Amino acid sequence: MLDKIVIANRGEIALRILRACKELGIKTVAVHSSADRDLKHVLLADETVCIGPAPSVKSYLNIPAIISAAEITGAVAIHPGYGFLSENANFAEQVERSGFIFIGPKAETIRLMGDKVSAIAAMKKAGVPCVPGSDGPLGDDMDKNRAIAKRIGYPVIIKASGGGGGRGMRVVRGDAELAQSISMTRAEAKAAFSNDMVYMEKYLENPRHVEIQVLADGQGNAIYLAERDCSMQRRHQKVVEEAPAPGITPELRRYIGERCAKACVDIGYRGAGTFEFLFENGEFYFIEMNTRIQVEHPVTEMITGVDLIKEQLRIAAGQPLSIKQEEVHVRGHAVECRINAEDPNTFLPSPGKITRFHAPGGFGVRWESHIYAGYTVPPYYDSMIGKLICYGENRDVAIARMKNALQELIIDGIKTNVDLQIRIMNDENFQHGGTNIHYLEKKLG
Ligand SMILES: Nc1ncc(C(=O)N(Cc2ccccc2)Cc2ccccc2)o1
Ligand SMILES: [Cl-]
């Protein structure tokens, strides 16, 4: 087992990782900004290192500082969590070049998945179903581009290769808008990603967002751990996630899961990863892969019993997966509600000091958060301050438990989305299940 690791993150995920480390007897180093001295996981860590002032650029994105902290403490590995540097291939490369273990895939794999065009080509080659599309970057020849659009059939969508997570894309419904749409997506991609490469896909009007969790070790084992529906979202920000995905049969699960695990083997994948699909009219279409552990991982843990962070750490130490595919069984149902410090009317971040706090409890209730009474939510970081995950023997029990748990949750002193989450749990279409990626925005409007 890894002797000591740096937790190169903050907030709830840093605490999640610290818990996994403690369970495994791994020493912890909490690197933190000067604004984050009183984070729960910082206070629980074996060693702490202040790596910079509040703004992320000089702390949680500060590569030299994070690597120096690993050097000075005698740490052997760095877990990037999610966000920040978790999908930064150059960081992963520098970490490994510096002699430390990066808890993630090989840097080349991170780079591959960060290049949406090359990722699609790799997945398509491996036998994973992808969205009908250009199968390559679009050039400047608008006769050729119209031809590609005709072949796919309108509506189409132009996406940035260096983009992802719903960012850097626009829908085109005919020839008249194609040139300008490509031109604009390209300009925006160059500005945001210093990469003006773009591609085309068939636009799917009302899909669900369904993603498959995988784990792969360095011994050649690769497994899938069912799926998550993350369709309840607002402006490419997930709000509620659940597992398994309603209406997905064990036969479909098996079909798509096996293809994802096959692709892992083909590409030499290692660690945790997520294959994102659009799911419409009973069909899966791969859009992108994430190499990090994600915010929504806990719902998968609840329905499979696999501790995904512990598996990450085991894999990095050179241990094989703790479970075989024939041992993975979907049992019950789990729902996650993200808890955000945000104003209900503007949806802008609402930082400040928490004056009263109470967490829910009971059977099937899991609360993932660093917050406590008297804790100040800083303005410098993301608005998500916690995750409430409820598990049941079925979806209706999970939802019932979530409603009860949301009613117990007290967070005074700041504005939160608890009321919104209660409305979602009480929503009759959500209660039916299978609502699409556009539902929440329509409901709110
Ligand atoms: N081929 C294709 N059709 C649609 C999409 C898409 O990626 N998105 C982005 C997205 C996916 C999942 C959750 C939230 C957003 C759907 C989309 C794209 C552009 C405008 C509205 C929705 O891709
Ligand atoms: Cl994530």
From Swiss-Prot:
Annotated residues for binding of ATP: K116, K159, G165, G166, E201, K202, Y203, L204, H209, H236, E276, E288
GO annotation, cellular component aspect: acetyl-CoA carboxylase complex; cytoplasm; cytosol
Biochemical pathway: Lipid metabolism; malonyl-CoA biosynthesis; malonyl-CoA from acetyl-CoA: step 1/1
GO biological processes: fatty acid biosynthetic process; malonyl-CoA biosynthetic process; negative regulation of fatty acid biosynthetic process
Cofactor note as given: Binds 2 magnesium or manganese ions per subunit.
Domain spans labelled ATP-grasp: 120-317
Residues binding biotin: R338
Residues that bind Mg(2+) 1: E276, E288
Annotated Mg(2+) 2 binding sites: E288, N290
SUPFAM superfamilies for the chain: Glutathione synthetase ATP-binding domain-like, PreATP-grasp domain, Rudiment single hybrid motif
Molecular-function GO term, any one: protein homodimerization activity
Cofactor: Mg(2+); Mn(2+)
Chain sites annotated for binding Mn(2+) 1: E276, E288
Pfam families: Biotin_carb_C, Biotin_carb_N, CPSase_L_D2
Catalytic residue list: R292
Residues the entry annotates as binding hydrogencarbonate: K238, R292, V295, R338
Annotated catalysed reactions: N(6)-biotinyl-L-lysyl-[protein] + hydrogencarbonate + ATP = N(6)-carboxybiotinyl-L-lysyl-[protein] + ADP + phosphate + H(+)
Highest taxon, organism lineage: Bacteria
Record domain Biotin carboxylation: where: 1-445
Keywords per UniProt: ATP-binding, Biotin, Fatty acid biosynthesis, Fatty acid metabolism, Ligase, Lipid biosynthesis, Lipid metabolism, Magnesium, Manganese, Metal-binding, Nucleotide-binding
Positions bound to Mn(2+) 2: E288, N290
Record text on subunit structure and interactions: Acetyl-CoA carboxylase is a heterohexamer of biotin carboxyl carrier protein, biotin carboxylase and the two subunits of carboxyl transferase in a 2:2 complex.
NCBIfam families, alphabetized: accC, PRK08591.1
Function of the molecule: This protein is a component of the acetyl coenzyme A carboxylase complex; first, biotin carboxylase catalyzes the carboxylation of the carrier protein and then the transcarboxylase transfers the carboxyl group to form malonyl-CoA.
Name this protein carries in UniProt: Biotin carboxylase
Species: Escherichia coli (strain K12)
Phylogenetic lineage: Bacteria, Pseudomonadati, Pseudomonadota, Gammaproteobacteria, Enterobacterales
